[PDB]
Amino acid sequence: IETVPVKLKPGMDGPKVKQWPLTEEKIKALVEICTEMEKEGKISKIGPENPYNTPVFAIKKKDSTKWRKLVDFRELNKRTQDFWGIPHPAGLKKKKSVTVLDVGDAYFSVPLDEDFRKYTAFTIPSINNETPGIRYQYNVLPQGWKGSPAIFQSSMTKILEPFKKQNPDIVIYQYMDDLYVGSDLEIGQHRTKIEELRQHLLRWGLTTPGYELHPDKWTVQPIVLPEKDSWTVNDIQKLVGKLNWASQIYPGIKVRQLCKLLRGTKALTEVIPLTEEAELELAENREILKEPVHGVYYDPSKDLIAEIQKQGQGQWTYQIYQEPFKNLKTGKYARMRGAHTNDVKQLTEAVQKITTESIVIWGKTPKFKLPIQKETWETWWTEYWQATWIPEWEFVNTPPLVKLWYNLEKEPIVG
Amino acid sequence: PISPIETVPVKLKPGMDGPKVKQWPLTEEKIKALVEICTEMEKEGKISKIGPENPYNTPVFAIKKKWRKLVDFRELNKRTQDFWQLGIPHPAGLKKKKSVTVLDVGDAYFSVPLDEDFRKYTAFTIPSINNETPGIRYQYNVLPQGWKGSPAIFQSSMTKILEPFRKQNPDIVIYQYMDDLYVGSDLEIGQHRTKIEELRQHLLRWGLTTPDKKHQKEPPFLWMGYELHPDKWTVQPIVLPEKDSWTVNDIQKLVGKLNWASQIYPGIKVRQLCKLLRGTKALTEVIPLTEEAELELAENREILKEPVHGVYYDPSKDLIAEIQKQGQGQWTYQIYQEPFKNLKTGKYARMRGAHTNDVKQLTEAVQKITTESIVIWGKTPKFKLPIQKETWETWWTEYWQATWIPEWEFVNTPPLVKLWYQLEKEPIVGAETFYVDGAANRETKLGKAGYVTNRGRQKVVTLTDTTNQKTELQAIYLALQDSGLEVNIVTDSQYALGIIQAQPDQSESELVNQIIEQLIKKEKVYLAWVPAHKGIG
Numbered sequence A: 001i002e003t004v005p006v007k008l009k010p011g012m013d014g015p016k017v018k019q020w021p022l023t024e025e026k027i028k029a030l031v032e033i034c035t036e037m038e039k040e041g042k043i044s045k046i047g048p049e050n051p052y053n054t055p056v057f058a059i060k061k062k063d064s065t066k067w068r069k070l071v072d073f074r075e076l077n078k079r080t081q082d083f084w085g086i087p088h089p090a091g092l093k094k095k096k097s098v099t100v101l102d103v104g105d106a107y108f109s110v111p112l113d114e115d116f117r118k119y120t121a122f123t124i125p126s127i128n129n130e131t132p133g134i135r136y137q138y139n140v141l142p143q144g145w146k147g148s149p150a151i152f153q154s155s156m157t158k159i160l161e162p163f164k165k166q167n168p169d170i171v172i173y174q175y176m177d178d179l180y181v182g183s184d185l186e187i188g189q190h191r192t193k194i195e196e197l198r199q200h201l202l203r204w205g206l207t208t209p210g211y212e213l214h215p216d217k218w219t220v221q222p223i224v225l226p227e228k229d230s231w232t233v234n235d236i237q238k239l240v241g242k243l244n245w246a247s248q249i250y251p252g253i254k255v256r257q258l259c260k261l262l263r264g265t266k267a268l269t270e271v272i273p274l275t276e277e278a279e280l281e282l283a284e285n286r287e288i289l290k291e292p293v294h295g296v297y298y299d300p301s302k303d304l305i306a307e308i309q310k311q312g313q314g315q316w317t318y319q320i321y322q323e324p325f326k327n328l329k330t331g332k333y334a335r336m337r338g339a340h341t342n343d344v345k346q347l348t349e350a351v352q353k354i355t356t357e358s359i360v361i362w363g364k365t366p367k368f369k370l371p372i373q374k375e376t377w378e379t380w381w382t383e384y385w386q387a388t389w390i391p392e393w394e395f396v397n398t399p400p401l402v403k404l405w406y407n408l409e410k411e412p413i414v415g
Numbered sequence B: 001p002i003s004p005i006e007t008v009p010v011k012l013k014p015g016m017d018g019p020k021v022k023q024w025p026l027t028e029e030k031i032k033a034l035v036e037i038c039t040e041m042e043k044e045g046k047i048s049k050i051g052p053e054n055p056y057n058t059p060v061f062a063i064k065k066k067w068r069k070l071v072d073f074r075e076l077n078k079r080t081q082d083f084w085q086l087g088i089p090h091p092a093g094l095k096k097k098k099s100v101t102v103l104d105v106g107d108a109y110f111s112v113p114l115d116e117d118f119r120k121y122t123a124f125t126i127p128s129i130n131n132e133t134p135g136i137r138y139q140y141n142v143l144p145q146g147w148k149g150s151p152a153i154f155q156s157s158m159t160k161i162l163e164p165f166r167k168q169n170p171d172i173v174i175y176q177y178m179d180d181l182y183v184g185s186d187l188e189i190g191q192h193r194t195k196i197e198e199l200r201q202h203l204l205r206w207g208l209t210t211p212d213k214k215h216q217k218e219p220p221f222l223w224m225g226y227e228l229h230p231d232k233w234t235v236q237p238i239v240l241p242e243k244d245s246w247t248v249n250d251i252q253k254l255v256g257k258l259n260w261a262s263q264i265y266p267g268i269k270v271r272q273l274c275k276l277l278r279g280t281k282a283l284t285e286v287i288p289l290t291e292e293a294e295l296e297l298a299e300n301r302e303i304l305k306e307p308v309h310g311v312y313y314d315p316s317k318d319l320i321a322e323i324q325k326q327g328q329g330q331w332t333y334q335i336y337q338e339p340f341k342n343l344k345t346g347k348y349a350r351m352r353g354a355h356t357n358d359v360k361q362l363t364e365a366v367q368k369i370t371t372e373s374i375v376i377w378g379k380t381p382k383f384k385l386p387i388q389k390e391t392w393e394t395w396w397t398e399y400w401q402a403t404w405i406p407e408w409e410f411v412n413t414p415p416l417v418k419l420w421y422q423l424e425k426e427p428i429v430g431a432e433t434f435y436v437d438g439a440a441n442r443e444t445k446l447g448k449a450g451y452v453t454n455r456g457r458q459k460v461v462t463l464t465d466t467t468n469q470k471t472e473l474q475a476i477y478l479a480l481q482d483s484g485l486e487v488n489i490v491t492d493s494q495y496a497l498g499i500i501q502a503q504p505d506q507s508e509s510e511l512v513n514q515i516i517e518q519l520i521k522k523e524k525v526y527l528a529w530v531p532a533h534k535g536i537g
């Protein structure tokens, strides 16, 4: 078959990223998964003349009790020529339900340009280094590579045409190995309609393995300030401090009248009666805070940033934006049942959940700013990772005021 | 002889061309020998004569260790493309073997053919008596000693050749390192012996030969400072050069070995000796050992007199990791399967940086142990930590940063690590409230720091040669000092907001440390921050 030539962006070279240590379990599985792929001619052993390398590891999807291979092609992707690919529909962000399907298997039936294969090199390590690693290189379109869906575009659209034309009411969006199907239909009709697509696809060779996404349950919550019968010097102080900060997002926020009440050296516990003016100032701030700041629009030609703060007691807040203080979306996240004592497990889930929304809403993974130590993250994140893609990320030190503010986000009266 | 193996395509780095170094001039005695030696190599097929159509050249020399040639590939190497082992196996990760046999494959480099396309760059020349007629010219047909690509290509070829044998005999372990092949197994001595000979003949099939008993290595194996014995491994003797005159350099070298050794012998100390370097003017400067240095250098000699042995890995047994807090910022750990039969020991040193706490440091040591464990035994140990579950749960569920400890267990081995203090979540009723403040002139460095309490008390100090940050921290210090066992402190310092969140118990700043000690002295402390310049005195 025809192999469309692929090329690195100009002036770029292949990736030379070190493989991270893997546990016995994971190594055994990769060996198993790879010997099989070798026979099927999907991949081939390579020599030391090839200097490139991309890291690989193994995971097990939810419910899934079988190991799947995952390659960190982030570097190779960043360096792969762009394709002038697949458009994004403003529809599924609205649709009542969205289902995610793994059509990653499909690519293995397509061959990859001979001249590019060398860059896909990777290494299965060995315990305690008692043996040389086992070096492979792909012969067919690999999963997780951005070139993949771009080249298998023509073929996917075709395969899909029948179902699309029969259901112009249902939205289909492709991102990486994932296929997002969205419809406003009935849970029964939606799910069953999935299978129709699923089998339809299965009918070509690509086994396509709650679970429903419900865009429009992702409504941005407002900030709510506390209310008391009696206010103490400490209460005003904490408030004023929070407000003074928020003024970076809402300039109409004033705290001059409250500060007035804080003149003097009183005991932090002493109660203070509010003046009619400071009472009004407060009323106005609440008012101002009733809606997201005006004039914030998504700029496609700029990166999305996702900042996450550890609130405590299994709670996490996050904000997505392109410019500080002009949030496109925000929220909270409470730990999944079972993550009882694992901060990393939670954070990992949070990233996946957040990233998925980013895909549905904008069709772009956000760059993460994680409230965790590099060493800690790299050591354990793959132990709970379950998506086929991998967002970009950097590690940071959460400013005290940022989490004090978002901790204030409104919650349901009951549920 | 040369073997029928497929060559590896090799090429120079993009752009650059083959080396052209002029041949160093040699004497009659040097030339005569080289000619001799090369005539030998050419007959074996190792190298081949070439005509001046080859513009490349590398300098050859003659050294006596009978004469022996030497080629300087520094240039060619610099021009050779790059290749993808530099991760060494650690003794603690090996599994006990009934028998280990080591085969030599020394001149195997000259047994592996070189890319016929690359051979041309390997050209060198044999000079004449002085500066007269053109000399003899050759080039390699095999992997040459000293070339950047030899080791890698050799390794790979070896792996290929060993594949079928490794398959047929899965119960046999081979470890290649340099030109040695360590074959081990749990078969019966006679059976093991038999297999080695099969392997040997399997190798001979590919030209690769094997020498006689004359130079056949046998346990113990001296490897990277370790002593590999069949039942256990020990550490190679660390001797301290007992001299009377000590130069700056000598001292530094000492501190080096001693620091390396502190891992195995956790008792070692070098503080008193690491003061002998203060203000040193020259590397060769002679320093008189202080009495304290004599005492220290002395004890270490005793410690290093003791024999420390470890044992090997048994996959059928679980992995235990136990940690101890030697002092502040110092940790020791041992990993074993059977109590007192350590597979590995070690220790961690820290700088305390801007601001950390003991619990945080504990987690970091765990992480480091965990990672190396994964590298060595492909598994993560079960931890035994000197910290109560209570303390842990109280600290991590509140810490601003994500953190974690794999499956662990509390071990009551003093001194337990604990939270030195905890700021109050709410203001203390019936406690003095100090409104602290500090201001400094960034340029004159003239500062003032002080406070005023709801109780009517007050103070203010004038600081000379100070920064703003200091006058701030200092105001907080004064309140801590002049207050009782319970205090409420409000400050508009951005840094106070720092310690509120992190509540560290070790800092780089002496002032911060002062404060921390004070923080620990109190029963209850509530630290509050408010906007600066907002008229909230």
Ligand SMILES: CCOCn1c(Cc2cc(C)cc(C)c2)c(C(C)C)c(=O)[nH]c1=O
Pocket: A130, B089, B094, B095, B096, B097, B100, B173, B174, B175, B182, B183, B184, B219, B221, B222, B223, B228, B229, B230, B231, B312
């Ligand atoms: C006699 C002890 O030799 C160490 N030894 C060995 C041999 C061995 C020898 C040397 C110099 C280094 C290394 C890393 C291993 C093996 C294998 C790799 C053959 C083994 O499985 N187990 C073991 O204990």
